[PDB]
PDB file of all heavy atoms in Angstrom:
ATOM      1  N   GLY Y 137     106.360 -41.059   6.777  1.00  2.00           N
ATOM      2  CA  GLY Y 137     105.885 -39.710   6.796  1.00  2.00           C
ATOM      3  C   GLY Y 137     106.910 -38.656   6.388  1.00  2.00           C
ATOM      4  O   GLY Y 137     106.783 -37.470   6.643  1.00  2.00           O
ATOM      5  N   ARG Y 138     107.967 -39.077   5.656  1.00  2.00           N
ATOM      6  CA  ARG Y 138     109.072 -38.152   5.369  1.00  2.00           C
ATOM      7  C   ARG Y 138     109.116 -37.689   3.912  1.00  2.00           C
ATOM      8  O   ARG Y 138     110.170 -37.177   3.470  1.00  2.00           O
ATOM      9  CB  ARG Y 138     110.418 -38.857   5.711  1.00  2.00           C
ATOM     10  CG  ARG Y 138     110.438 -39.049   7.232  1.00  2.00           C
ATOM     11  CD  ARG Y 138     111.748 -39.760   7.568  1.00  2.00           C
ATOM     12  NE  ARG Y 138     112.883 -39.064   7.010  1.00  2.00           N
ATOM     13  CZ  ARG Y 138     113.835 -39.524   6.190  1.00  2.00           C
ATOM     14  NH1 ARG Y 138     113.887 -40.785   5.798  1.00  2.00           N
ATOM     15  NH2 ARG Y 138     114.773 -38.659   5.855  1.00  2.00           N
ATOM     16  N   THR Y 139     108.002 -37.858   3.229  1.00  2.00           N
ATOM     17  CA  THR Y 139     107.949 -37.404   1.835  1.00  2.00           C
ATOM     18  C   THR Y 139     108.436 -35.933   1.674  1.00  2.00           C
ATOM     19  O   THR Y 139     109.296 -35.649   0.871  1.00  2.00           O
ATOM     20  CB  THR Y 139     106.514 -37.491   1.237  1.00  2.00           C
ATOM     21  OG1 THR Y 139     106.188 -38.883   1.290  1.00  2.00           O
ATOM     22  CG2 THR Y 139     106.538 -36.959  -0.204  1.00  2.00           C
ATOM     23  N   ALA Y 140     107.875 -35.061   2.540  1.00  2.00           N
ATOM     24  CA  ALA Y 140     108.197 -33.665   2.377  1.00  2.00           C
ATOM     25  C   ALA Y 140     109.665 -33.382   2.648  1.00  2.00           C
ATOM     26  O   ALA Y 140     110.330 -32.741   1.795  1.00  2.00           O
ATOM     27  CB  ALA Y 140     107.312 -32.753   3.245  1.00  2.00           C
ATOM     28  N   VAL Y 141     110.241 -33.837   3.754  1.00  2.00           N
ATOM     29  CA  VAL Y 141     111.639 -33.528   4.017  1.00  2.00           C
ATOM     30  C   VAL Y 141     112.571 -34.166   2.983  1.00  2.00           C
ATOM     31  O   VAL Y 141     113.554 -33.559   2.525  1.00  2.00           O
ATOM     32  CB  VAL Y 141     112.022 -33.975   5.461  1.00  2.00           C
ATOM     33  CG1 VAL Y 141     112.037 -35.498   5.643  1.00  2.00           C
ATOM     34  CG2 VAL Y 141     113.348 -33.378   5.867  1.00  2.00           C
ATOM     35  N   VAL Y 142     112.257 -35.361   2.529  1.00  2.00           N
ATOM     36  CA  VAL Y 142     113.126 -35.978   1.519  1.00  2.00           C
ATOM     37  C   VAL Y 142     113.109 -35.203   0.206  1.00  2.00           C
ATOM     38  O   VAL Y 142     114.169 -34.837  -0.378  1.00  2.00           O
ATOM     39  CB  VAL Y 142     112.728 -37.430   1.305  1.00  2.00           C
ATOM     40  CG1 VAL Y 142     113.402 -38.036   0.050  1.00  2.00           C
ATOM     41  CG2 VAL Y 142     113.072 -38.325   2.503  1.00  2.00           C
ATOM     42  N   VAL Y 143     111.921 -34.940  -0.338  1.00  2.00           N
ATOM     43  CA  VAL Y 143     111.833 -34.321  -1.642  1.00  2.00           C
ATOM     44  C   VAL Y 143     112.315 -32.905  -1.620  1.00  2.00           C
ATOM     45  O   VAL Y 143     112.968 -32.418  -2.559  1.00  2.00           O
ATOM     46  CB  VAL Y 143     110.384 -34.443  -2.168  1.00  2.00           C
ATOM     47  CG1 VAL Y 143     110.353 -33.709  -3.476  1.00  2.00           C
ATOM     48  CG2 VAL Y 143     109.892 -35.853  -2.349  1.00  2.00           C
ATOM     49  N   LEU Y 144     112.036 -32.165  -0.519  1.00  2.00           N
ATOM     50  CA  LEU Y 144     112.457 -30.775  -0.494  1.00  2.00           C
ATOM     51  C   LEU Y 144     113.981 -30.708  -0.355  1.00  2.00           C
ATOM     52  O   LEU Y 144     114.656 -29.853  -0.883  1.00  2.00           O
ATOM     53  CB  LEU Y 144     111.748 -30.034   0.649  1.00  2.00           C
ATOM     54  CG  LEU Y 144     110.262 -29.860   0.356  1.00  2.00           C
ATOM     55  CD1 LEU Y 144     109.638 -28.956   1.429  1.00  2.00           C
ATOM     56  CD2 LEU Y 144     110.074 -29.312  -1.021  1.00  2.00           C
ATOM     57  N   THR Y 145     114.503 -31.679   0.384  1.00  2.00           N
ATOM     58  CA  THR Y 145     115.970 -31.692   0.503  1.00  2.00           C
ATOM     59  C   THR Y 145     116.633 -32.049  -0.790  1.00  2.00           C
ATOM     60  O   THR Y 145     117.721 -31.480  -1.157  1.00  2.00           O
ATOM     61  CB  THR Y 145     116.356 -32.672   1.606  1.00  2.00           C
ATOM     62  OG1 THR Y 145     115.851 -32.176   2.885  1.00  2.00           O
ATOM     63  CG2 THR Y 145     117.844 -32.679   1.769  1.00  2.00           C
ATOM     64  N   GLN Y 146     116.080 -32.964  -1.597  1.00  2.00           N
ATOM     65  CA  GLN Y 146     116.627 -33.293  -2.913  1.00  2.00           C
ATOM     66  C   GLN Y 146     116.664 -32.085  -3.822  1.00  2.00           C
ATOM     67  O   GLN Y 146     117.646 -31.808  -4.512  1.00  2.00           O
ATOM     68  CB  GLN Y 146     115.819 -34.396  -3.576  1.00  2.00           C
ATOM     69  CG  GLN Y 146     115.988 -35.747  -2.842  1.00  2.00           C
ATOM     70  CD  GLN Y 146     115.012 -36.783  -3.331  1.00  2.00           C
ATOM     71  OE1 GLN Y 146     113.931 -36.437  -3.791  1.00  2.00           O
ATOM     72  NE2 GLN Y 146     115.354 -38.079  -3.242  1.00  2.00           N
ATOM     73  N   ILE Y 147     115.538 -31.329  -3.904  1.00  2.00           N
ATOM     74  CA  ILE Y 147     115.521 -30.207  -4.845  1.00  2.00           C
ATOM     75  C   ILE Y 147     116.386 -29.058  -4.321  1.00  2.00           C
ATOM     76  O   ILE Y 147     117.070 -28.360  -5.144  1.00  2.00           O
ATOM     77  CB  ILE Y 147     114.081 -29.743  -5.184  1.00  2.00           C
ATOM     78  CG1 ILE Y 147     114.073 -28.851  -6.428  1.00  2.00           C
ATOM     79  CG2 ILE Y 147     113.371 -29.168  -3.991  1.00  2.00           C
ATOM     80  CD1 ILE Y 147     112.733 -28.573  -7.094  1.00  2.00           C
ATOM     81  N   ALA Y 148     116.417 -28.904  -3.006  1.00  2.00           N
ATOM     82  CA  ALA Y 148     117.305 -27.871  -2.468  1.00  2.00           C
ATOM     83  C   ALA Y 148     118.726 -28.087  -2.857  1.00  2.00           C
ATOM     84  O   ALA Y 148     119.484 -27.174  -3.128  1.00  2.00           O
ATOM     85  CB  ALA Y 148     117.139 -27.784  -0.968  1.00  2.00           C
ATOM     86  N   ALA Y 149     119.217 -29.301  -2.840  1.00  2.00           N
ATOM     87  CA  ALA Y 149     120.572 -29.627  -3.236  1.00  2.00           C
ATOM     88  C   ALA Y 149     120.834 -29.232  -4.687  1.00  2.00           C
ATOM     89  O   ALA Y 149     121.897 -28.627  -5.005  1.00  2.00           O
ATOM     90  CB  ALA Y 149     120.911 -31.126  -3.045  1.00  2.00           C
ATOM     91  N   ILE Y 150     119.882 -29.585  -5.557  1.00  2.00           N
ATOM     92  CA  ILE Y 150     120.016 -29.174  -6.977  1.00  2.00           C
ATOM     93  C   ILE Y 150     120.084 -27.674  -7.098  1.00  2.00           C
ATOM     94  O   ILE Y 150     120.952 -27.106  -7.756  1.00  2.00           O
ATOM     95  CB  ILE Y 150     118.855 -29.775  -7.796  1.00  2.00           C
ATOM     96  CG1 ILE Y 150     119.083 -31.278  -7.930  1.00  2.00           C
ATOM     97  CG2 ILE Y 150     118.637 -29.110  -9.139  1.00  2.00           C
ATOM     98  CD1 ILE Y 150     117.775 -32.026  -8.271  1.00  2.00           C
ATOM     99  N   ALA Y 151     119.162 -26.998  -6.395  1.00  2.00           N
ATOM    100  CA  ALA Y 151     119.075 -25.532  -6.577  1.00  2.00           C
ATOM    101  C   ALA Y 151     120.304 -24.821  -6.053  1.00  2.00           C
ATOM    102  O   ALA Y 151     120.636 -23.745  -6.586  1.00  2.00           O
ATOM    103  CB  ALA Y 151     117.840 -25.054  -5.824  1.00  2.00           C
ATOM    104  N   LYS Y 152     120.958 -25.366  -5.063  1.00  2.00           N
ATOM    105  CA  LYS Y 152     122.149 -24.698  -4.491  1.00  2.00           C
ATOM    106  C   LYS Y 152     123.187 -24.470  -5.570  1.00  2.00           C
ATOM    107  O   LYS Y 152     124.026 -23.578  -5.438  1.00  2.00           O
ATOM    108  CB  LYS Y 152     122.609 -25.587  -3.333  1.00  2.00           C
ATOM    109  CG  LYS Y 152     123.912 -25.720  -2.679  1.00  2.00           C
ATOM    110  CD  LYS Y 152     124.822 -24.512  -2.705  1.00  2.00           C
ATOM    111  CE  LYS Y 152     126.294 -24.832  -2.586  1.00  2.00           C
ATOM    112  NZ  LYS Y 152     127.135 -24.025  -3.539  1.00  2.00           N
ATOM    113  N   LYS Y 153     123.247 -25.281  -6.651  1.00  2.00           N
ATOM    114  CA  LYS Y 153     124.319 -25.259  -7.643  1.00  2.00           C
ATOM    115  C   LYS Y 153     123.858 -24.495  -8.888  1.00  2.00           C
ATOM    116  O   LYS Y 153     124.629 -24.469  -9.887  1.00  2.00           O
ATOM    117  CB  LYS Y 153     124.850 -26.663  -7.943  1.00  2.00           C
ATOM    118  CG  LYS Y 153     125.466 -27.359  -6.738  1.00  2.00           C
ATOM    119  CD  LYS Y 153     126.667 -26.566  -6.204  1.00  2.00           C
ATOM    120  CE  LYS Y 153     127.303 -27.134  -4.966  1.00  2.00           C
ATOM    121  NZ  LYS Y 153     127.860 -28.506  -5.142  1.00  2.00           N
ATOM    122  N   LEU Y 154     122.685 -23.927  -8.894  1.00  2.00           N
ATOM    123  CA  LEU Y 154     122.116 -23.176 -10.040  1.00  2.00           C
ATOM    124  C   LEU Y 154     121.874 -21.715  -9.751  1.00  2.00           C
ATOM    125  O   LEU Y 154     121.728 -21.371  -8.578  1.00  2.00           O
ATOM    126  CB  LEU Y 154     120.722 -23.786 -10.390  1.00  2.00           C
ATOM    127  CG  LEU Y 154     120.760 -25.256 -10.830  1.00  2.00           C
ATOM    128  CD1 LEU Y 154     119.365 -25.665 -11.127  1.00  2.00           C
ATOM    129  CD2 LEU Y 154     121.651 -25.430 -12.046  1.00  2.00           C
ATOM    130  N   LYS Y 155     121.792 -20.906 -10.806  1.00  2.00           N
ATOM    131  CA  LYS Y 155     121.372 -19.526 -10.711  1.00  2.00           C
ATOM    132  C   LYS Y 155     119.947 -19.380 -11.267  1.00  2.00           C
ATOM    133  O   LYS Y 155     119.494 -20.274 -11.949  1.00  2.00           O
ATOM    134  CB  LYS Y 155     122.261 -18.601 -11.556  1.00  2.00           C
ATOM    135  CG  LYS Y 155     123.723 -18.559 -11.218  1.00  2.00           C
ATOM    136  CD  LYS Y 155     124.510 -18.120 -12.452  1.00  2.00           C
ATOM    137  CE  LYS Y 155     125.466 -16.983 -12.170  1.00  2.00           C
ATOM    138  NZ  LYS Y 155     126.869 -17.242 -12.618  1.00  2.00           N
ATOM    139  N   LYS Y 156     119.309 -18.245 -10.967  1.00  2.00           N
ATOM    140  CA  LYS Y 156     117.955 -18.058 -11.372  1.00  2.00           C
ATOM    141  C   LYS Y 156     117.749 -18.309 -12.883  1.00  2.00           C
ATOM    142  O   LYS Y 156     116.811 -19.030 -13.252  1.00  2.00           O
ATOM    143  CB  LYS Y 156     117.434 -16.669 -10.975  1.00  2.00           C
ATOM    144  CG  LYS Y 156     115.934 -16.543 -11.243  1.00  2.00           C
ATOM    145  CD  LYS Y 156     115.423 -15.155 -10.836  1.00  2.00           C
ATOM    146  CE  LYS Y 156     113.997 -14.968 -11.273  1.00  2.00           C
ATOM    147  NZ  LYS Y 156     113.380 -13.738 -10.679  1.00  2.00           N
TER     148      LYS Y 156
END
Side-chain angles (χ1 to χ4, degrees):
Chain Y
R138 294 177 53 235
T139 300
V141 69
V142 167
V143 176
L144 291 187
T145 295
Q146 291 170 331
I147 195 166
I150 288 161
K152 157 28 205 137
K153 298 299 179 60
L154 297 180
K155 301 155 129 129
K156 188 178 171 170

